[PDB]
Amino acid sequence: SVIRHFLRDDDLSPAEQAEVLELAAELKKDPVSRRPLQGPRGVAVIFDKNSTRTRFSFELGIAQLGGHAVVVDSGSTQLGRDETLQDTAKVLSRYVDAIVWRTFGQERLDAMASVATVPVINALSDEFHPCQVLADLQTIAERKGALRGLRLSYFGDGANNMAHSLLLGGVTAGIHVTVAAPEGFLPDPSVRAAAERRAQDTGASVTVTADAHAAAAGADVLVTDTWTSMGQENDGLDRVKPFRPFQLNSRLLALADSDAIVLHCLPAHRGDEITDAVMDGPASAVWDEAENRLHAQKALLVWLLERS
Amino acid sequence: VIRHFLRDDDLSPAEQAEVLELAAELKKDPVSRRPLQGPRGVAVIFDKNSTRTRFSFELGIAQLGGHAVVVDSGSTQLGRDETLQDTAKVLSRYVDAIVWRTFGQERLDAMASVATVPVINALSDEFHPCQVLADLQTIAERKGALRGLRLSYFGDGANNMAHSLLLGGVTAGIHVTVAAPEGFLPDPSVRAAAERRAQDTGASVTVTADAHAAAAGADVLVTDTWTDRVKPFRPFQLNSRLLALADSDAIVLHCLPAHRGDEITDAVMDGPASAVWDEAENRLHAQKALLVWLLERS
Amino acid sequence: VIRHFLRDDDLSPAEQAEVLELAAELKKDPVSRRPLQGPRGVAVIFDKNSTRTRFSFELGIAQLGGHAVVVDSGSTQLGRDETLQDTAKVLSRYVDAIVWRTFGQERLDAMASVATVPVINALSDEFHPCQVLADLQTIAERKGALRGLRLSYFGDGANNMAHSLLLGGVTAGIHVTVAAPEGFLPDPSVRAAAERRAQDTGASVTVTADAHAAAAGADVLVTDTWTSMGQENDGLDRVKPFRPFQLNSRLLALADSDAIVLHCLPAHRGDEITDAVMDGPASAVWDEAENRLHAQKALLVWLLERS
Ligand SMILES: N#Cc1ccc(O)cc1F
Ligand SMILES: N#Cc1ccc(O)cc1F
Numbered sequence: 085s086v087i088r089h090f091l092r093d094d095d096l097s098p099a100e101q102a103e104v105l106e107l108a109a110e111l112k113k114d115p116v117s118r119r120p121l122q123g124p125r126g127v128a129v130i131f132d133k134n135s136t137r138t139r140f141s142f143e144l145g146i147a148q149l150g151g152h153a154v155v156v157d158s159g160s161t162q163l164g165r166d167e168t169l170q171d172t173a174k175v176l177s178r179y180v181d182a183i184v185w186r187t188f189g190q191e192r193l194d195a196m197a198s199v200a201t202v203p204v205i206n207a208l209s210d211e212f213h214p215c216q217v218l219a220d221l222q223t224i225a226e227r228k229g230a231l232r233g234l235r236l237s238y239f240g241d242g243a244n245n246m247a248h249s250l251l252l253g254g255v256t257a258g259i260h261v262t263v264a265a266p267e268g269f270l271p272d273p274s275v276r277a278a279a280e281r282r283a284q285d286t287g288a289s290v291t292v293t294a295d296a297h298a299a300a301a302g303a304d305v306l307v308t309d310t311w312t313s314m315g316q317e318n319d320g321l322d323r324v325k326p327f328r329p330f331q332l333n334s335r336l337l338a339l340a341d342s343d344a345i346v347l348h349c350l351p352a353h354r355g356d357e358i359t360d361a362v363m364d365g366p367a368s369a370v371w372d373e374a375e376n377r378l379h380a381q382k383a384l385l386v387w388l389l390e391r392s
Numbered sequence: 393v394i395r396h397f398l399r400d401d402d403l404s405p406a407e408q409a410e411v412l413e414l415a416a417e418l419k420k421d422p423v424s425r426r427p428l429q430g431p432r433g434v435a436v437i438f439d440k441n442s443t444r445t446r447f448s449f450e451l452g453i454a455q456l457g458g459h460a461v462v463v464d465s466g467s468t469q470l471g472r473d474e475t476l477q478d479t480a481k482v483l484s485r486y487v488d489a490i491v492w493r494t495f496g497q498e499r500l501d502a503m504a505s506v507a508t509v510p511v512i513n514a515l516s517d518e519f520h521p522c523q524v525l526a527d528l529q530t531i532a533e534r535k536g537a538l539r540g541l542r543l544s545y546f547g548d549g550a551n552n553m554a555h556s557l558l559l560g561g562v563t564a565g566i567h568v569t570v571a572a573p574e575g576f577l578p579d580p581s582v583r584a585a586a587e588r589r590a591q592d593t594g595a596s597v598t599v600t601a602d603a604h605a606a607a608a609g610a611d612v613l614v615t616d617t618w619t620d621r622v623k624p625f626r627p628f629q630l631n632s633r634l635l636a637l638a639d640s641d642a643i644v645l646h647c648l649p650a651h652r653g654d655e656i657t658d659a660v661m662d663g664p665a666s667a668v669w670d671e672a673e674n675r676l677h678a679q680k681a682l683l684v685w686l687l688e689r690s
Numbered sequence: 691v692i693r694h695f696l697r698d699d700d701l702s703p704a705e706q707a708e709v710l711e712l713a714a715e716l717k718k719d720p721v722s723r724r725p726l727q728g729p730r731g732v733a734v735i736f737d738k739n740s741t742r743t744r745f746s747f748e749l750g751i752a753q754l755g756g757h758a759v760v761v762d763s764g765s766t767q768l769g770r771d772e773t774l775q776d777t778a779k780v781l782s783r784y785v786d787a788i789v790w791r792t793f794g795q796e797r798l799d800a801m802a803s804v805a806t807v808p809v810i811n812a813l814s815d816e817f818h819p820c821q822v823l824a825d826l827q828t829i830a831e832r833k834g835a836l837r838g839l840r841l842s843y844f845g846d847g848a849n850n851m852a853h854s855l856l857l858g859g860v861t862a863g864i865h866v867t868v869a870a871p872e873g874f875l876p877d878p879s880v881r882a883a884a885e886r887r888a889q890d891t892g893a894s895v896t897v898t899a900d901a902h903a904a905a906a907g908a909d910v911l912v913t914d915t916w917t918s919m920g921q922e923n924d925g926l927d928r929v930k931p932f933r934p935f936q937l938n939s940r941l942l943a944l945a946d947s948d949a950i951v952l953h954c955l956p957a958h959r960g961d962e963i964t965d966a967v968m969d970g971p972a973s974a975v976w977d978e979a980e981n982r983l984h985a986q987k988a989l990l991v992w993l994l995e996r997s
Contacts, residue, residue: 116430123721126749134467136479140486144433147459152752154745157467160762161741167956175955178980179745310473317472350482351473375485423728441765447784451731454757466764648780649772673783 087392089197090384091206093214093253094278098286101256107383108222120389121151126180130156132187137350138207141377142184149382173200182385203388213245216349217253218380223373224305227345232258236305239264239296239330240357246309246349248275251290255283262291264299266326296330300339307347308332308357333359337367345369394690396504397682398513400521400560401585405593408563414681415529427687428458433487437463439494444648445514448675449491456680461487480506489683510686520552523647524560525678530671531612534643539565539594543612546603546628547655550576553616553647558586562595569598571606573624603628607637614645615655631657635665643667693996694802694809695989698819698858699883703891706861712988713827725994726756731785735761735768737792742955743812746982747789754987778805787990808993818850821954822858823985828978829910832950837863842904843912844869844935845962847876851914851954856884860893867896869904871931901935905944912952913937913962937963942972950974
């Protein structure tokens with residue numbers, strides 16, 4: 085069989101993504117009913133940078149599939165230094181049945197996936213966060229039912245990992261995705277083109293605008309994220325002033341549909357991209373969204389393992 | 393409705409007895425209780441690493457059928473925009489209990505008020521209540537009934553072990569004495585809490601600088617690392633001459649690591665009064681019992 | 691009556707054969723032996739980290755039904771806060787075996803002198819006996835019976851792999867040659883122990899500076915990194931003495947036509963071994979790495995039932 089990887093959201097077709105999201109709902113109801121890793125079989129979980137959500141959701145998810153996660157903080161290792169990534173991938177493929185990797189550049193994930201003989205999963209990278217968007221889609225479906233035709237708007241830095249993955253994963257689900265971002269902070273052009281092409285297949289659409297109020301009007305789902313990642317703290321830009329009109333506050337939420345929901349990949353900076361009132365209010369689905377990392381990632385692993 | 397265990401008197405006398413009974417049952421049948429079968433998760437977070445805390449909790453949780461997600465001190469520093477409150481809310485969606493080794497009690501109190509799962513103090517600046525559960529299990533299996541025994545702690549009377557031996561000890565009905573020099577005495581609100589709890593159990597609290605008087609007639613003698621900056625503590629060294637003053641069949645306890653030659657001697661710690669190895673083992677059984685008990689009440 | 695595995699000759703020839711047979715059985719049926727069901731614990735302690743040692747032991751212990759408790763070098767090093775003897779007595783109350791990667795051999799001896807459970811050397815300055823069990827399992831699955839094979843190791847002749855290939859190799863009846871430059875020769879006590887064990891098994895020990903001779907007629911060619919992290923600041927040029935001992939296509943071509951190549955990871959391609967050799971048809975390095983899992987599981991099963 086072809087070995088399947090999941091490095092970006094569009095690695096699943098629309099039909100394949102629907103299968104994974106249905107499995108995520110099934111596993112949330114019956115969390116130990118799928119045991120493909122019984123043995124236990126191993127799964128590598130490798131962190132170039134720590135993440136509470138990523139650590140807990142993957143380590144426990146793998147265990148609940150019957151497996152054993154070998155969790156590596158690569159700062160305590162000589163990854164990239166003492167041997168080639170190609171050599172590392174070949175050795176890993178002898179010990180584990182899948183490789184879960186939180187890293188920075190997408191080309192490293194690509195390299196690992198081209199030589200590993202087991203599925204490689206992007207746990208979080210500079211360019212994409214496709215596991216978070218699977219959890220987001222599960223959360224939206226839980227609240228709203230069918231994803232096809234919903235309107236989702238994302239606010240803030242339009243070129244970070246969540247903007248890119250909401251574009252790709254959202255249109256794969258048939259969602260009309262709007263990115264509201266200031267000029268200079270727009271989605272990567274190749275990602276945007278990929279999302280526009282995928283949107284043709286599902287009847288979705290891609291909109292990019294600097295008009296935050298227009299983006300909010302009529303939306304079913306409002307999303308934001310931190311305006312700055314760790315790598316961008318030293319990029320030289322004022323990363324507050326451009327984004328202030330894009331804050332997800334009560335005024336913005338009130339422009340959306342009356343039962344709109346709010347998502348935010350953690351962590352959050354209350355007072356910057358989102359306010360206390362919204363973050364902690366009745367429209368917020370942030371905690372269910374975090375919990376669904378566990379269920380959605382389990383579903384993804386089950387699906388990749390059986391196809392690989 | 394969620395119970396926490398952040399200091400020894402979070403358990404009433406009757407609840408402490410239940411936990412200690414369960415610890416004895418679990419020591420006999422270590423995989424007979426599987427409340428975390430699945431596995432269900434438990435967070436084990438170290439703001440400062442502790443190898444023996446990691447072994448006892450990580451294996452104990454596994455023997456309850458669960459899976460401990462262990463976060464070492466390197467991984468415990470919160471990145472940009474992370475917060476303790478948001479951490480507690482997220483952990484409550486992934487795990488069934490939170491075990492935390494941290495410093496100030498204020499952090500534990502905050503985690504407990506936000507989390508919707510039980511929070512356990514694995515070890516903190518002010519208290520080490522899981523060690524004292526293991527200590528009480530050790531005393532009980534060697535001496536039977538805890539009520540009315542005399543226990544003396546020697547050395548730094550201001551540290552977490554002194555506070556927990558006071559609170560956990562009087563909760564079990566034990567007459568507790570702390571022998572310590574004047575700059576190193578129990579925190580006064582802990583002392584007053586221990587004196588109050590002792591009225592309910594028939595116990596008592598004594599604080600003295602007289603190590604001789606503290607040892608005389610003692611049934612249990614306890615010490616801990618003292619950390620010259622250590623001169624005030626030398627008169628409190630738990631040595632062979634101090635042990636000679638205790639009741640017959642007295643037992644010696646020491647939460648590890650021991651620095652032989654300082655707070656305790658080779659002769660006392662390798663001698664027939666020593667229970668320090670059984671004590672260390674009982675961290676496993678007592679903490680498993682505590683977890684079983686908290687989970688069933690939460 | 692508690693058995694430890696601190697160096698390769700802690701197993702007799704017959705005992706080593708039992709462990710290697712079990713490694714082959716466990717490779718076939720990896721969850722058929724559950725001596726640690728419960729789970730029972732096993733300590734896996736690193737004074738210096740080894741992620742590859744971590745993968746193989748953590749998963750191997752789990753597949754025996756147990757739970758590995760892993761301690762990395764980010765905690766207070768064992769022996770600093772309390773005696774190693776006190777540490778062994780406490781660990782013995784929590785776990786059924788102690789797996790430890792440390793530095794000098796005296797530390798392993800100290801822990802094993804007191805522990806009431808088996809102590810296993812995961813990797814040390816002087817020996818790497820678990821890697822050589824994996825190597826012997828690999829050689830056996832590629833070549834059959836080990837007795838009488840000719841194995842040559844090239845490079846730093848006084849490191850842990852050179853010492854363990856000597857001891858573990860002659861225990862299996864393999865004729866072992868170490869090809870190394872002057873100043874980098876096997877420890878004399880290890881060589882003498884290997885020579886004595888070789889008299890029981892029909893094996894032999896050869897130490898030579900002639901790489902061509904070492905390679906000629908060899909069934910197995912082995913190398914390792916020329917320098918450990920601890921050696922980077924020892925003051926020596928640790929490249930120029932070893933260039934004649936590079937395991938390259940020229941050198942491989944002198945060996946038997948069916949020769950295989952081993953290298954415990956990681957490899958520094960272009961130094962001790964070339965890309966052509968690493969990635970060519972004689973290389974068994976990836977099976978070798980996999981067999982760390984199986985050989986260490988067999989060792990654990992065997993030690994637990996003897997203790
Ligand atoms: N995982 C990560 C992490 C860091 C700090 C903390 O207090 C808790 C955690 F789960
Ligand atoms: N870092 C991570 C990691 C995982 C497996 C391995 O063989 C080496 C590594 F550095």
